[PDB]
Each structure stands twice: as C-alpha cells, then as structure tokens.
Amino acid sequence: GDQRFGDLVFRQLAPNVWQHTSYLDMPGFGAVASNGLIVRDGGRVLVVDTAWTDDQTAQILNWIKQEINLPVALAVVTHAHQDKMGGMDALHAAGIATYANALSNQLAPQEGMVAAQHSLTFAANGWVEPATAPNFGPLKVFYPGPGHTSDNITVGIDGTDIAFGGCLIKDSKAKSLGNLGDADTEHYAASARAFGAAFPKASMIVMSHSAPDSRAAITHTARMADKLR
Ligand SMILES: Cn1c(=O)cc(CP(=O)(O)O)c2ccc(C3CC3)cc21
Ligand SMILES: Cn1c(=O)cc(CP(=O)(O)O)c2ccc(C3CC3)cc21
Ligand SMILES: [Zn+2]
Ligand SMILES: [Zn+2]
C-alpha cells in the first residue's frame, strides 16, 4: 500500500524495509519521482538516499519517528545528484552519520551538493572496503563501475530479496538510459551486468524513479547499454 505522508509516499517492501518517494517539478519532464530506502536493523534505522530537498528529507525523518520511532543510525547516498543527495543538511541537522562513495564526496561541490561526512572506498571487484562502512549491518554496498554517473553505487539488503541499483538501472519498459549527461556509455553495460551478478538473490529490484521491478530491469538496462557501445 502507498502511504501518503505530506507530499511524500511510503511503501513497505518487506517486514523491515520501506521505499521513500519524493517529487520535484522540472519543465519538460513533469513532477519527477525519486525513490530511496528505509531499513530497520534491530533497534535502529538505516536510510538509503535523501529526498530532492532538505524539507522533504526532514519529512522522511518525521515519517520514521511516527511509523518506527527508533533512531536513524546512518544514511548512505548512491550518487552526487539532487534526487539522492539534495537533503544532506537535513540528515546532518538530525545528527545522522552520512556515507557516500569517495568520488561522490569529491564531486559534491561542483554538483551543488553538500558532501557526506564519510567516504566509502571499494576493492577492485566493487565490494565496499569494510573499514569505510562500519556498523552497516544488513546493508551490502557495491560499486558496479561507471554508468549513469562515474560515482554511482548500489545496495542490497541481507535477509531480503531486495537490491537497489539507484539511477544505474532503468525499468524493464524504459525507452532509453535517460540522463546521458554524466554517463559512461562505454562501461554502462558491464556496470549493469555487474550489479546483477553482485546480488543474485535479489528478485525485487528497487527503481530510482518508478515502482519496483523484476531482474528483467537489469537485462533490459544492459541490452539498452549494449546499443551505445
Ligand atoms: C530532467 N531530470 C534531471 O535534470 C535530473 C534527474 C535526476 P538524475 O539525473 O539523478 O536521474 C531526473 C530524473 C528523472 C527524470 C525523468 C522525467 C524523465 C528527469 C530528470
Ligand atoms: C529522458 N529521461 C528518462 O527517461 C529518465 C531519466 C532519469 P535516469 O537518468 O535515472 O534514467 C532522465 C534523467 C535526466 C534527463 C536529463 C537531460 C535532462 C532525461 C531523462
Ligand atoms: Zn543522477
Ligand atoms: Zn535518475
């Protein structure tokens, strides 16, 4: 069920997992949805991605207060664009520890974003260096290589069938790869397939801008990227 809470929408995906959705008008595009995640890990909550704005991100924290009423231990942001990083100051005002790809933090200022407090680094095969992601509990963080951006990262939730490609993965009906502006058309297809191979148990693929999809979103994305090589 899609729970309306001020101008945002919350949908439960699993017993301990919810999707947050926020909207931003843009001319030529309409009121664009952006999704992130909320995970309960025992007596704390973990957030993946801000909303577009501080006010929206403050409303996510208000929804967590009312519907979960446990402290938010940390948030991880999946790339340095407004839809996933626009509410960083709201997280910092709430005393929430914040994490992003080192490259996301490096890009933040030129992208008009506020950097996270902590930088994630990755091994050669894409898995997060554990020292950089302390206390992440069931959040598994994977850098698939460059795609929608150079810095895009992905998350799976241990003990669920859920993984989140952020803006790397398009829905199975999408007509294009969308934002080519900061994209890596050469490496995109390999990056999409690497996400799939990182999270083989994830039957539910949470989309950046639409409803959850099947792993057909991953194949469709890879095939669309194969055309741009
Ligand atoms: C026009 N437009 C932007 O300038 C920025 C975004 C956010 P991202 O680049 O992270 O997808 C964005 C996201 C989705 C859409 C959809 C209506 C096509 C447009 C968007
Ligand atoms: C046409 N179009 C889409 O269908 C989907 C998106 C969002 P994403 O890059 O995450 O797929 C999208 C994002 C940005 C743009 C921007 C150039 C303004 C177009 C887009
Ligand atoms: Zn983006
Ligand atoms: Zn996007």
Could you give the C-alpha distances from 191 to 35, 111, 149, 207, 223, in angstroms and in order? 20, 22, 11, 16, 12
Could you give the C-alpha distances from 140 to 37, 208, 216, in angstroms and in order? 13, 18, 21
Which residues is 92 bridged to in the sheet?
none
Q: How many domains does the chain have?
A: 1
Cα angle 119-189-35, degrees, rounded to a multiple of 5: 55
173 is in an annotated binding site: no
| CATH code of the domain containing 47 | 3.60.15.10
Tell me which amino acid residue 1 is. Answer: G
The residue contributing the CA closest to ligand 2 atom 3 is 178
The pair of structure tokens assigned to 224 is: 């669309």
Cα gap 3→5, rounded to integer Å:
6
- Residue 100: which residues within 8 A CB-CB, separation 6 or more? 76, 77, 80, 85, 108, 115, 116, 118, 119, 120, 151, 153
For residue 25, how many other CB atoms are within 10 A of its CB? 9
Please report the atom of ligand 2 found closest to the CA of residue 176: 4
Dihedral class, residue 155 (left if φ above 0, else alpha if ψ from -120 to 50, else beta): beta
Contact (Cβ atoms closer than 8 angstroms) between residue 198 and residue 154: yes
Mutate to test the pocket of ligand 1, among 22, 24, 26 (most ligand atoms within 8 A of CB): 26
Cα gap 69→99, rounded to integer Å:
22
Cα gap 168→145, rounded to integer Å:
10
The pair of structure tokens assigned to 188 is: 């995109």
DSSP state of 122: B
> Residue 102 burial by CB count (10 A; 0-12/13-18/19+): exposed, middle or buried?
middle
End-to-end CA distance of the chain: 40
Lining residues, ligand 2, CB within 6 Å: 148, 167, 170, 176, 178-179, 181, 208-209
What pairing do the DSSP bridges indicate for beta strands 17-26 and 30-41? antiparallel
- Domain assignment of residue 90, given as a range: 2-227
Q: Which one, of 22, 28, 26, lies nearest residue 8 by Cα?
A: 22
